[PDB]
């Protein structure tokens, strides 16, 4: 409850990230799933064409959150080797047959997700549609249609997306959200999985046409190239440092100053020093013997009304000896001075045994 005069390291300052920057490369090469579900023409159930795709950005969220479907019997956070996206039309109650039925045993056999949509809008020909061919048994005779049909007899354009988890690397990765880029502000940066904290700025380094990252001798990442745009950005460490409190001692006063080691006073009587930022101490042009060492030649003291002052400590009086080639100074008196020197000699002899300390009669 009482602290003696001095400098004390209380806590640790660290600029909390105003934002967590995440910069996935611009979402391009959109997967052709946009046109699979409403292609100009679809094949028969038995003639289901495989639209296997690789290295495409399949946006399942827009498809899943479309409000223009019939059954989503299953996504953008998962990447897969390929998507065996089928394409066909089934008659009403056959939708339930597409699940892990006439269609389920003759035309299709599901061992992914299933998407269905009202086919009466486009595929249903007016006056009788027979373009599709139906395998009644497993045998292709006809399908049959009527525009004035109900729901169980109504066709449904169904595309069956079957995700693959083969040993081959996943290639159909869904879109990943990205933040914006803000410079000159501590923010957590994650462009392509390289998450970290640092102030983001424009750098002078030139990257190789292929290189994306940059690292220091200690293997730490220092500069990055934005995947969305070819800008070389230097990632400096996010501002942080210790917080130490100058106190002249409770026995003297309760006023204190706070030092933020290694900061510019912009991230926090505010005085900028080579040792950090001083708050609560007023800079004085005078120089005295060091009382409390702030650092970098700066010391803080309590003096007269009273306050804490920060000053550049003085090394002593600026004496100049009256030297000349033919003058000598010779003492005419003397003084007998008895000074003190204190040296530690020994410590306390402490003995400790494990079994008592570690376990204890156990």
């Amino acid at each position: 409850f009482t602290v003696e005069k001095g400098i004390y390291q209380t806590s640790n300052f660290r600029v909390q990230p105003t934002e967590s920057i995440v910069r996935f490369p611009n979402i391009t090469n959109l997967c052709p799933f946009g046109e699979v579900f409403n292609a100009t023409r679809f094949a028969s159930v038995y003639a289901w064409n495989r639209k296997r795709i690789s290295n495409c950005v399949a946006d399942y969220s827009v498809l899943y959150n479309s409000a223009s479907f019939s059954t989503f019997k299953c996504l953008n956070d998962l990447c897969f080797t390929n998507v065996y996206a089928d394409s066909f039309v089934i008659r009403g109650d056959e939708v339930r047959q597409i699940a892990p039925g006439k269609i389920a045993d003759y035309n299709y056999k599901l061992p992914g997700c299933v998407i269905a949509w009202n086919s009466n809008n486009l595929d249903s020909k007016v006056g009788g549609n027979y373009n599709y061919l139906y395998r009644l048994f497993r045998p292709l005779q006809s399908y049959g249609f009527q525009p004035t049909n109900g729901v169980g007899y109504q066709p449904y354009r169904v595309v069956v997306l079957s995700f693959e988890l083969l040993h081959a690397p996943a290639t159909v990765c869904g879109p990943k959200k990205s933040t914006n880029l803000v410079k000159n502000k501590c923010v957590n940066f994650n462009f392509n999985g390289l998450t970290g904290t640092g102030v983001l700025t424009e750098s002078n380094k030139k990257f190789l046409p292929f290189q994306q990252f940059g690292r220091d001798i200690a293997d730490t990442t220092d500069a990055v190239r934005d995947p969305q745009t070819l800008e070389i950005l230097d990632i400096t460490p996010c501002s942080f440092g210790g917080v130490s409190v100058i106190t002249p001692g409770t026995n003297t006063s309760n006023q204190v100053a706070v030092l933020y080691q290694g900061v510019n006073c912009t991230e926090v009587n505010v005085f900028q020093t080579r040792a950090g930022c001083l708050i609560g101490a007023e800079h004085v042009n005078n120089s005295y013997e060091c009382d409390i060492p702030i650092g970098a030649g700066i010391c803080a003291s309590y003096q007269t009304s009273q306050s804490i002052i920060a000053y550049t400590m003085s090394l002593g009086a600026e004496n100049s000896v009256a030297y000349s080639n033919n003058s000598i100074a010779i003492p005419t008196n003397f003084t007998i001075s008895v000074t003190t020197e204190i040296l530690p000699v020994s410590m306390t002899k402490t003995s400790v045994d494990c079994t008592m300390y570690i376990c204890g009669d156990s």
Binding site: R274, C290, P293, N319, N326, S327
Partner: protein, 366 residues
Amino acid sequence: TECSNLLLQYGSFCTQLNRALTGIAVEQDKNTQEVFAQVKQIYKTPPIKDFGGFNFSQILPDPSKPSKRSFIEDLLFNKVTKFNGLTVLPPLLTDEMIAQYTSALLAGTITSGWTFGAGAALQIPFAMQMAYRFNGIGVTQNVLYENQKLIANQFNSAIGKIQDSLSSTASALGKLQDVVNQNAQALNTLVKQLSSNFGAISSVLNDILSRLDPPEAEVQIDRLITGRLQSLQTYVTQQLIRAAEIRASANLAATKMSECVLGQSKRVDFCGKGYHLMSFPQSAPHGVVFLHVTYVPAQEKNFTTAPAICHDGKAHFPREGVFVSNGTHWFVTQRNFYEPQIITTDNTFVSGNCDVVIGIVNNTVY
């Protein structure tokens, strides 16, 4: 935050580590202060540089440059060449302040001799001061005044050679460079240790948390904590071991400043090789440099010597010196410089008879 809760289970291992490091940091300021804050006042050399023929221009501060740093100090500084919670604190005494202390110590020695280190600075002509130093190594003071021009030239040439040795070769300051390298790699090794699994699935906590549920992610995190905590322990222990080593070196530099710079040392090989005369401190990065001015005898020649001589049935011994012979005549000379002179009753003392001393000779005393 998931880890920070886990790390609390280890208690106060980290209040200990910070206490150990802050204890080291406070010591480093004490080391520098003890070595350099050896002068009560900031003595200044006079504008007139009539030092009997000695020019200390290469060791005195040069106000032309911003740092007001000596010429040789500049050579020393050139020769010697905030990532993951790691901060380097600035020393309490700036390089400019250290260079001011050496200037004060240097200015005091030139103008006062050893007096300023034992009280008030008492001026004395440098040539007369060097006479004290010669007298303090067993050589009479007339040899300095008679050879003042030669001795001054020898000092200037010797100081000139130190410039070439430092400027030409960058390997002279190995001791100071080694300290910098050891600290630099200690931090690099500590930082590089963050990239090791220590047995966990990965060295990145985000990956561990992302790819595992808290139960089986907690065990993986604990492996990282123990390894990273252990690596932080070895760093502090090494620093404590090194800090003790540097403190011993700093304690030695402090003693050398007191005994070599603030006075004349009779201790052999302490302040350079030979007979100590003077020492001049110079400031170097994270260290100090001493220019030990030493008196080396040279061009010896053989002589025939006796312990005493018989004059009138009584043995004469030299008051301070040696008995030497030309092969035909006998003289008495000081030990460290051949200055023969007539053997008289004023530079010898009589004690006893002639038949107790082995090697007695039969010369005459005038």
